[PDB]
Design a protein around this ligand. Sequence first.
Ligand SMILES: [Mg+2]
Ligand SMILES: [Mg+2]
Ligand SMILES: [Mg+2]
Ligand SMILES: [Mg+2]
Ligand SMILES: [Mg+2]
Ligand SMILES: [Mg+2]
Ligand SMILES: [Mg+2]
Ligand SMILES: [Mg+2]
Ligand SMILES: [Mg+2]
Ligand SMILES: [Mg+2]
Ligand SMILES: [Mg+2]
Ligand SMILES: [Mg+2]
Ligand SMILES: [Mg+2]
Length: 51
Amino acid sequence: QQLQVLLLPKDPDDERNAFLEVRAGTGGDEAALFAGDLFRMYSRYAEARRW
RNA sequence: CCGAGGGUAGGGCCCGUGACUGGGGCGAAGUCGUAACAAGGUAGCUGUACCGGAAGGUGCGGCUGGAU
Ligand SMILES: [Mg+2]
Ligand SMILES: [Mg+2]
Ligand SMILES: [Mg+2]
Ligand SMILES: [Mg+2]
Ligand SMILES: [Mg+2]
Ligand SMILES: [Mg+2]
Ligand SMILES: [Mg+2]
Ligand SMILES: [Mg+2]
Ligand SMILES: [Mg+2]
Ligand SMILES: [Mg+2]
Ligand SMILES: [Mg+2]
Ligand SMILES: [Mg+2]
Ligand SMILES: [Mg+2]
Protein backbone atom coordinates (compact mmCIF):
# COMPACT_ATOMS: atom_id res chain seq x y z
CA GLN A 1 0.00 0.00 0.00
CA GLN A 2 1.66 3.18 -1.28
CA LEU A 3 0.83 5.59 1.56
CA GLN A 4 -0.06 8.85 -0.18
CA VAL A 5 2.16 11.68 1.08
CA LEU A 6 -0.17 13.75 3.28
CA LEU A 7 2.63 16.12 4.33
CA LEU A 8 1.96 18.99 1.91
CA PRO A 9 -0.78 21.14 3.55
CA LYS A 10 0.27 22.97 6.72
CA ASP A 11 -1.95 23.92 9.64
CA PRO A 12 -1.60 26.64 12.31
CA ASP A 13 -4.23 25.95 15.00
CA ASP A 14 -4.40 22.20 14.47
CA GLU A 15 -2.82 20.99 17.73
CA ARG A 16 -4.04 23.87 19.90
CA ASN A 17 -6.54 23.33 22.70
CA ALA A 18 -10.14 23.96 21.68
CA PHE A 19 -13.27 25.50 23.16
CA LEU A 20 -16.41 23.42 22.64
CA GLU A 21 -19.90 24.75 23.35
CA VAL A 22 -23.18 22.91 22.73
CA ARG A 23 -26.45 24.84 22.55
CA ALA A 24 -30.01 23.54 22.38
CA GLY A 25 -32.15 24.15 19.32
CA THR A 26 -35.53 23.22 17.92
CA GLY A 27 -37.70 21.14 20.24
CA GLY A 28 -38.01 22.52 23.77
CA ASP A 29 -36.50 20.65 26.69
CA GLU A 30 -35.98 17.68 24.36
CA ALA A 31 -33.11 19.41 22.56
CA ALA A 32 -31.77 20.56 25.93
CA LEU A 33 -31.89 16.89 26.94
CA PHE A 34 -29.91 15.97 23.82
CA ALA A 35 -27.28 18.70 24.28
CA GLY A 36 -26.23 16.80 27.38
CA ASP A 37 -26.28 13.60 25.32
CA LEU A 38 -23.87 15.24 22.88
CA PHE A 39 -21.73 16.60 25.73
CA ARG A 40 -21.31 13.28 27.55
CA MET A 41 -20.39 11.77 24.18
CA TYR A 42 -17.64 14.36 23.73
CA SER A 43 -16.73 13.81 27.39
CA ARG A 44 -16.35 10.07 26.81
CA TYR A 45 -14.20 10.92 23.78
CA ALA A 46 -11.97 13.44 25.59
CA GLU A 47 -11.20 11.17 28.55
CA ALA A 48 -10.67 8.25 26.14
CA ARG A 49 -7.65 10.19 24.81
CA ARG A 50 -6.41 11.58 28.16
CA TRP A 51 -7.73 15.09 27.49
C1' C B 1 -55.91 94.57 -27.44
C1' C B 2 -55.53 89.46 -26.84
C1' G B 3 -51.77 85.98 -26.87
C1' A B 4 -47.73 80.40 -26.76
C1' G B 5 -44.73 80.76 -23.13
C1' G B 6 -41.02 82.79 -19.81
C1' G B 7 -40.20 85.10 -14.94
C1' U B 8 -41.34 86.54 -9.69
C1' A B 9 -44.34 85.34 -5.41
C1' G B 10 -47.79 82.59 -2.56
C1' G B 11 -51.22 78.57 -1.86
C1' G B 12 -53.64 73.23 -2.76
C1' C B 13 -53.27 67.93 -3.90
C1' C B 14 -50.55 63.44 -4.90
C1' C B 15 -46.06 60.27 -5.06
C1' G B 16 -41.29 58.76 -3.74
C1' U B 17 -37.86 59.20 0.33
C1' G B 18 -35.94 60.18 5.90
C1' A B 19 -32.11 59.79 11.48
C1' C B 20 -35.56 57.84 14.59
C1' U B 21 -40.10 55.99 16.55
C1' G B 22 -45.15 53.38 17.27
C1' G B 23 -47.61 49.30 17.14
C1' G B 24 -49.04 44.89 13.60
C1' G B 25 -48.52 40.05 11.00
C1' C B 26 -45.47 35.49 10.76
C1' G B 27 -42.05 31.60 13.75
C1' A B 28 -41.73 22.90 14.69
C1' A B 29 -37.62 25.68 20.13
C1' G B 30 -36.35 30.58 24.20
C1' U B 31 -37.61 33.67 29.23
C1' C B 32 -41.59 35.17 32.75
C1' G B 33 -45.83 34.06 34.79
C1' U B 34 -51.07 31.51 33.78
C1' A B 35 -55.66 35.92 32.04
C1' A B 36 -59.81 32.91 29.52
C1' C B 37 -62.45 27.95 28.38
C1' A B 38 -64.95 23.45 34.42
C1' A B 39 -67.67 27.60 39.71
C1' G B 40 -60.76 27.55 34.89
C1' G B 41 -59.60 27.41 41.31
C1' U B 42 -61.51 35.74 42.50
C1' A B 43 -68.17 33.33 37.74
C1' G B 44 -67.44 35.73 32.97
C1' C B 45 -68.05 39.62 29.67
C1' U B 46 -68.66 44.82 29.21
C1' G B 47 -68.44 50.97 28.65
C1' U B 48 -65.48 54.15 31.49
C1' A B 49 -61.66 55.54 35.08
C1' C B 50 -57.28 54.78 37.69
C1' C B 51 -53.26 51.41 38.18
C1' G B 52 -49.55 47.28 37.42
C1' G B 53 -43.25 43.47 34.23
C1' A B 54 -46.98 40.96 31.43
C1' A B 55 -51.19 38.52 30.59
C1' G B 56 -54.32 41.67 33.89
C1' G B 57 -56.35 44.14 38.63
C1' U B 58 -59.69 47.31 41.03
C1' G B 59 -63.73 51.18 41.24
C1' C B 60 -68.78 52.62 39.25
C1' G B 61 -72.80 51.03 36.60
C1' G B 62 -74.69 47.35 33.09
C1' C B 63 -75.59 42.14 30.55
C1' U B 64 -76.24 36.49 31.41
C1' G B 65 -73.72 34.73 26.71
C1' G B 66 -73.06 32.31 34.96
C1' A B 67 -71.94 26.91 37.58
C1' U B 68 -74.07 25.41 42.60
MG1 LIG C 1 -50.46 92.58 -23.16
MG1 LIG D 1 -51.34 85.04 -20.09
MG1 LIG E 1 -49.25 82.12 -17.54
MG1 LIG F 1 -39.69 49.44 13.06
MG1 LIG G 1 -60.12 36.83 35.46
MG1 LIG H 1 -56.84 30.55 35.05
MG1 LIG I 1 -61.38 33.28 36.75
MG1 LIG J 1 -63.81 47.43 34.20
MG1 LIG K 1 -47.07 51.61 33.70
MG1 LIG L 1 -41.18 45.30 38.21
MG1 LIG M 1 -54.67 47.54 41.93
MG1 LIG N 1 -69.45 45.28 38.66
MG1 LIG O 1 -79.20 48.44 30.63
